[PDB]
Amino acid sequence: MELILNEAEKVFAMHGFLGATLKQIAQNSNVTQALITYYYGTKQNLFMEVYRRGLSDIDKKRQNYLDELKSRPEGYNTYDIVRTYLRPQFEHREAGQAWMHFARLQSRLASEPEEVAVPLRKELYDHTLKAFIHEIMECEGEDDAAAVSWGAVFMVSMILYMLRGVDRIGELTDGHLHAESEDDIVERMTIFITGGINSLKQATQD
Template identity: 40%
Template structure:
């Protein structure tokens, strides 16, 4: 006789017998959103893979959107806090930071995610897909999570680069964001184009070479 199917857990978190924690659900959801994106992901799949009921997910997070936002803010705000801490440390020194130091500080927290295991990499993939998600969700999350620290770096770059006006500073930072997001996406076109001679496996080399490229663009004379 086959064993009866295992019931998925749907108790409320106050139940003394215990239930899967919110973190366990978040870990599964992070993988599902990374694989499918927000629109295509379903609470049904998340519930099945986490071995809980959809009702428990709704109890904790309210909706699929609430679950996605919780995930994105959890890691995204950590990146922003690390960025701001690095910037604060640079600005607290007697000598002002130069463009290379600022760009390195801006990039480092994002690329550090690649060395923090599979769950952090799932967030990296979620983030790379964000521009494919509905505008009302993706634009708001970017504003709430990243705008404050990014504006602070733009202001610092204007002080660090002689002649860099506000327009160029904003344009060039957005180009920098687009470039580093592509390099984080995991598509190693470098290995393909170079026929395997070069790869993006060494995170330190990626950050160093990307910084070289971005500093050159950010500090270049205006073409206007």
């Protein structure tokens, strides 16, 4: 059910898709390559299963948080939607091994070959991103699709980068500023994205 996947996850996170071998994953899992192949077919499908498992929980949480929003008596807005989308990528219990590996794996996604990345994002990222765009468009004052759609692209870029867990803010401020917590990071991303979407909207026409 799970042990091979966990090991595969670790090896992919460390070496990427190309550098990972089924040899190594079989060794680390104490099984044969043939058994891994039996269950998962190709290295590419194993990689997809690792992403399927990780993103299934994340998207389930996004859906729960979005449902919560829709049950609020006093309504919700763009800020809330963005937060909802971001939270499940950054919240964990602070130990959080399972979290780390999949965070690191996603943070490397841009370096994976397009042959695996294209079908991956088509199956596992696109639908939920389109739904997020759609939800934002249903808000009051939101009737510029370009602004929201570009906003979504830039949001993704921020997610992948922050998933690295590098203290970039600290590096750039000589240690004077740091993220306080995962929630501070989510908060700052949310505000930044919400404002950016507004400015894209505002800049089209007057």
